[PDB]
Amino acid sequence: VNKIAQESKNIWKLQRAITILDTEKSFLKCMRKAFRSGKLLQVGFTPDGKDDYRWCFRVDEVNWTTW
Amino acid sequence: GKIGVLAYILQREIHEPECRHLSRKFTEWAYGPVHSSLYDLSCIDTCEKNSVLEVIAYSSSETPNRHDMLLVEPLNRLLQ
Amino acid sequence: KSLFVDSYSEILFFVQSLFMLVSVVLYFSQRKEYVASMVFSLAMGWTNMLYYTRGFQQMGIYAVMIEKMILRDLCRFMF
Amino acid sequence: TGKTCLLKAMLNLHNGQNDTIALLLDVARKTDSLKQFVNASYTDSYYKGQTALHIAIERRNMTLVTLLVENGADVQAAANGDFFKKTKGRPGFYFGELPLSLAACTNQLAIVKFLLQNSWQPADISARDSVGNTVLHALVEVADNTVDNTKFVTSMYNEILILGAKLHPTLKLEEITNRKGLTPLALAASSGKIGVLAYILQREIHEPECRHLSRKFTEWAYGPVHSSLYDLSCIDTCEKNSVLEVIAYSSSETPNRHDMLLVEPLNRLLQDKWDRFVKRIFYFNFFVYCLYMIIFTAAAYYRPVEGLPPYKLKNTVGDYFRVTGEILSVSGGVYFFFRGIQYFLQRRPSLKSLFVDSYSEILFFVQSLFMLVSVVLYFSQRKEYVASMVFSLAMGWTNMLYYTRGFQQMGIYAVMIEKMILRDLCRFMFVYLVFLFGFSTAVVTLIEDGKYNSLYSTCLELFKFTIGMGDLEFTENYDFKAVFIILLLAYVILTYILLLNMLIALMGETVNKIAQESKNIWKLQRAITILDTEKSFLKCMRKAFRSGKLLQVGFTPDGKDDYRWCFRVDEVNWTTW
Amino acid sequence: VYLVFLFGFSTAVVTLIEDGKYNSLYSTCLELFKFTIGMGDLEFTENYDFKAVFIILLLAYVILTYILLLNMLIALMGET
Ligand SMILES: CCCCCCCCCCCCC(=O)O[C@@H](COC(=O)CCC)COP(=O)(O)O[C@H]1[C@H](O)[C@@H](O)[C@@H](O)[C@@H](O)[C@@H]1O
Numbered sequence: 086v087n088k089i090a091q092e093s094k095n096i097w098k099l100q101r102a103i104t105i106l107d108t109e110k111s112f113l114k115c116m117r118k119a120f121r122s123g124k125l126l127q128v129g130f131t132p133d134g135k136d137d138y139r140w141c142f143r144v145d146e147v148n149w150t151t152w
Numbered sequence: 153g154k155i156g157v158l159a160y161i162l163q164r165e166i167h168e169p170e171c172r173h174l175s176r177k178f179t180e181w182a183y184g185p186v187h188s189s190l191y192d193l194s195c196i197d198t199c200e201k202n203s204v205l206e207v208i209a210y211s212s213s214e215t216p217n218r219h220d221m222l223l224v225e226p227l228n229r230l231l232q
Numbered sequence: 233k234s235l236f237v238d239s240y241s242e243i244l245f246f247v248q249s250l251f252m253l254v255s256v257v258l259y260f261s262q263r264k265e266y267v268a269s270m271v272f273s274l275a276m277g278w279t280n281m282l283y284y285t286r287g288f289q290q291m292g293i294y295a296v297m298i299e300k301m302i303l304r305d306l307c308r309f310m311f
Numbered sequence: 312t313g314k315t316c317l318l319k320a321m322l323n324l325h326n327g328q329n330d331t332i333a334l335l336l337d338v339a340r341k342t343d344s345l346k347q348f349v350n351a352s353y354t355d356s357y358y359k360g361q362t363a364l365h366i367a368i369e370r371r372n373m374t375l376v377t378l379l380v381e382n383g384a385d386v387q388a389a390a391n392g393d394f395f396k397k398t399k400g401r402p403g404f405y406f407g408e409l410p411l412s413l414a415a416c417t418n419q420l421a422i423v424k425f426l427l428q429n430s431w432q433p434a435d436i437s438a439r440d441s442v443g444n445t446v447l448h449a450l451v452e453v454a455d456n457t458v459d460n461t462k463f464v465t466s467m468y469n470e471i472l473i474l475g476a477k478l479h480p481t482l483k484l485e486e487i488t489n490r491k492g493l494t495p496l497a498l499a500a501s502s503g504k505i506g507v508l509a510y511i512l513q514r515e516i517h518e519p520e521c522r523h524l525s526r527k528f529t530e531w532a533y534g535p536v537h538s539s540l541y542d543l544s545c546i547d548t549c550e551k552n553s554v555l556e557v558i559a560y561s562s563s564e565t566p567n568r569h570d571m572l573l574v575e576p577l578n579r580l581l582q583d584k585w586d587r588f589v590k591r592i593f594y595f596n597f598f599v600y601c602l603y604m605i606i607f608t609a610a611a612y613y614r615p616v617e618g619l620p621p622y623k624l625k626n627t628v629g630d631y632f633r634v635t636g637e638i639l640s641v642s643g644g645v646y647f648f649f650r651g652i653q654y655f656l657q658r659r660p661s662l663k664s665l666f667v668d669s670y671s672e673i674l675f676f677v678q679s680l681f682m683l684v685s686v687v688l689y690f691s692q693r694k695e696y697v698a699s700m701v702f703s704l705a706m707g708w709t710n711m712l713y714y715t716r717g718f719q720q721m722g723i724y725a726v727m728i729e730k731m732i733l734r735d736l737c738r739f740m741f742v743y744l745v746f747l748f749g750f751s752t753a754v755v756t757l758i759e760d761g762k763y764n765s766l767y768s769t770c771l772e773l774f775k776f777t778i779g780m781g782d783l784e785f786t787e788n789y790d791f792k793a794v795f796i797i798l799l800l801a802y803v804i805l806t807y808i809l810l811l812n813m814l815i816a817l818m819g820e821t822v823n824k825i826a827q828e829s830k831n832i833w834k835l836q837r838a839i840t841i842l843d844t845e846k847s848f849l850k851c852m853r854k855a856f857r858s859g860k861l862l863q864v865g866f867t868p869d870g871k872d873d874y875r876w877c878f879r880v881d882e883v884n885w886t887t888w
Numbered sequence: 889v890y891l892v893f894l895f896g897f898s899t900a901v902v903t904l905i906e907d908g909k910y911n912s913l914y915s916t917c918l919e920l921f922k923f924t925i926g927m928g929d930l931e932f933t934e935n936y937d938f939k940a941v942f943i944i945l946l947l948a949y950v951i952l953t954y955i956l957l958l959n960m961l962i963a964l965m966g967e968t
């Protein structure tokens with residue numbers, strides 16, 4: 086038990102990930118809300134004049150250094 | 153199971169002209185110490201065949217770091 | 233080999249169902265031994281309840297620890 | 312949104328420069344007027360109140376700050392839009408809404424000093440935002456107990472105090488309260504900002520005309536030895552938010568509520584209070600409770616065995632003693648009942664703090680409830696009162712462990728018992744009960760027309776394995792003996808060999824990790840005991856107020872002298888002669 | 889701690905019992921002690937009413953002393 090704590094957390098997270106993927110693959114209801122994060126424009130400037138919408142996922146962060 | 157390369161790619165941010173579009177991590181706003189980043193998630197959440205989540209989850213049990221790869225930041229937050 | 237070194241829960245649920253089906257066959261085969269099958273399935277069914285401890289962080293991690301104890305320490309000790 | 316061209320230009324700076332800003336300001340001057348232009352601000356509910364000065368500060372552009380202030384910008388413009396509120400469910404950044412608090416919250420000391428000591432419009436250092444929080448309150452808010460954050464927050468807090476004293480010697484910044492009545496010290500204590508609290512409580516300022524601001528003073532220092540003094544104002548006692556009261560009666564969600572009492576003056580003060588005042592009272596309370604439980608045990612043990620209570624009192628000594636003990640036991644039950652109600656009413660727990668914390672008061676209340684139910688059944692002519700009474704009796708004896716606090720060795724042991732029950736026994740009992748019920752159902756299904764053949768008897772019979780009494784051949788009323796024995800062996804292996812030994816391993820793992828947490832929790836438990844004792848006190852005793860009214864500096868900002876009830880701590884150092 | 893638990897539940901059980909073979913603080917104290925050494929009968933008497941109360945008391949005692957406290961003692965001695 087002293088040695089498998091982190092391994093146990095990792096395996097649990099993997100087991101939950103498998104459950105999630107099976108649920109989203111089955112879904113029994115033609116639900117599209119399983120597709121998360123929203124179709125946002127990251128740059129809006131591809132190598133050509135077009136804009137790129139890339140389904141990005143938002144993460145807030147706070148840092149008190151490197152002002 | 154090349155966790156290092158995966159960790160690099162998923163949060164790659166390129167600060168120069170004509171190579172911004174190559175990034176997969178973008179910073180939208182940053183007021184003070186607070187800033188809101190955006191991860192790409194193309195071919196992570198869903199795609200034609202090889203979604204990264206599908207590839208890791210349905211790995212063959214011999215991949216070296218199949219347990220650790222999900223600790224990479226955007227994947228952990230996305231699964232939660 | 234991947235069939236047995238990994239995906240234990242699929243095996244256990246499948247074996248539960250196998251015992252159930254053998255129970256049905258014996259039941260309609262006019263053998264009392266269907267009871268012998270049924271109880272085994274019943275026992276396994278309740279132990280397979282632990283499959284659902286995932287989704288609960290404390291209990292899921294605990295269940296993984298139980299799994300690993302069975303595979304490593306209980307196996308060596310029992311031999 | 313309502314943003315003007317100036318605000319658009321300010322949000323687009325190239326290496327901190329944008330020449331069109333001075334162009335727009337000069338044009339505004341020459342057109343009609345500037346004061347409305349330079350104070351233009353957003354109107355939408357998200358960025359409401361944001362103005363160019365805020366943008367200058369957050370961009371860390373000194374030049375624009377100086378220019379905008381010079382041109383008559385409002386240094387008291389409050390940005391109270393939704394992005395500038397706490398609002399845990401939305402993104403944003405709280406900083407106190409004011410340019411001075413914004414400068415302080417972003418580690419920009421030069422801008423703070425300029426805003427305070429500019430020629431055109433100096434900032435009001437005592438100003439308060441919509442929440443009532445002034446700069447010091449905001450600085451407490453932005454703390455998160457991390458090293459790099461805490462360093463600058465403590466430093467800026469120090470510097471703002473120095474500047475406030477120099478500019479307004481008669482102003483007492485730390486005495487300002489927000490809408491909640493909290494001073495920055497009380498706010499730091501309530502919110503668990505242990506770093507800032509540790510800074511404040513032992514603050515020492517070595518310079519003339521700022522000595523009075525310190526809270527740690529050195530009276531004499533002969534050689535390596537020197538005797539320091541801690542202020543203890545608003546720690547030991549005050550109007551509302553005593554620091555000890557704030558920490559002890561925290562809502563259990565405060566991050567560092569266990570750690571905050573490790574701060575030196577608090578720990579020494581609590582120990583002094585204990586030894587001087589509370590130790591004797593607590594021991595006496597323990598003695599009284601022991602007498603109560605002995606009397607209750609004696610009353611219950613000698614209950615009559617005839618049917619149909621209540622029972623006629625026999626004119627004999629033993630029955631007089633029995634009914635006397637019964638009356639006293641019911642009295643004590645009522646006492647703990649009303650104490651539980653009083654605790655609930657005074658603390659008003661929000662139905663989660665009622666269960667996730669304060670287990671002792673719940674247990675004593677439950678004991679008293681069982682006593683009252685016992686009385687009701689007793690006079691209701693039901694023998695079932697016995698069923699109630701015994702539970703109360705059992706709980707009463709186990710509640711004796713409540714008094715293991717106040718003993719350093721035993722209280723830690725009691726805390727570890729609590730943690731074992733809450734973590735490891737709960738997880739084990741869930742899994743064990745799943746296995747037990749599953750195999751019980753299997754075995755009782757196999758058994759037919761036997762003595763057992765029933766869920767209760769088979770469950771108990773399998774449970775006997777856990778206590779080392781499993782028969783392993785308790786019945787033959789089945790067919791397929793091989794199936795029966797296989798089930799029992801599998802149950803034994805899975806539960807007895809694996810799970811109990813795994814429980815031992817996990818308890819060993821847990822004990823290795825909760826040593827310091829146990830010391831902190833025990834210290835907190837004893838602190839709560841001390842505060843309750845000094846709060847009730849039943850005699851109007853003034854010895855509870857410790858440390859003695861000493862003169863610290865004797866030189867306030869005016870010629871008055873300061874008597875601050877300081878607490879003396881003697882210390883030695885064999886370095887830095 | 890163990891003696892507090894033992895005495896508390898002994899007094900509870902001997903209170904519940906009436907006019908039995910045990911019906912005495914010593915006999916019940918010894919009988920509950922037998923659980924600690926792995927010899928607890930768990931049905932040592934029926935001289936009561938309220939069987940559910942009796943069995944609930946014994947199970948609570950067993951859980952608190954045998955399962956919790958003894959394993960806790962082992963863990964603490966390991967730390968020591
Ligand atoms: C007569 C009665 C006999 C019953 C005997 C059985 C008792 C336990 C029953 C409890 C049920 C728990 C369960 O359902 O199975 C547990 C483990 O079961 C065992 O330990 C079998 C011991 C044989 C988790 O199974 P899982 O599918 O998650 O396997 C994990 C992969 O998924 C994951 O990707 C990783 O590769 C990870 O390394 C894998 O483990």
Ligand SMILES: CCCCCCCCCCCCC(=O)O[C@@H](COC(=O)CCC)COP(=O)(O)O[C@H]1[C@H](O)[C@@H](O)[C@@H](O)[C@@H](O)[C@@H]1O
Pocket residue numbers: 563668669670671672674702705706709710712713728729730732733832835836948952
């Ligand atoms: C039929 C018979 C059954 C008896 C069942 C019960 C047996 C145990 C009886 C032992 C009595 C010990 C006791 O009297 O209670 C112990 C806790 O024991 C339990 O775990 C009860 C589980 C229910 C201390 O409770 P405490 O009030 O100190 O809670 C702490 C706060 O005070 C502190 O400020 C912190 O917030 C900390 O996080 C809190 O924990």
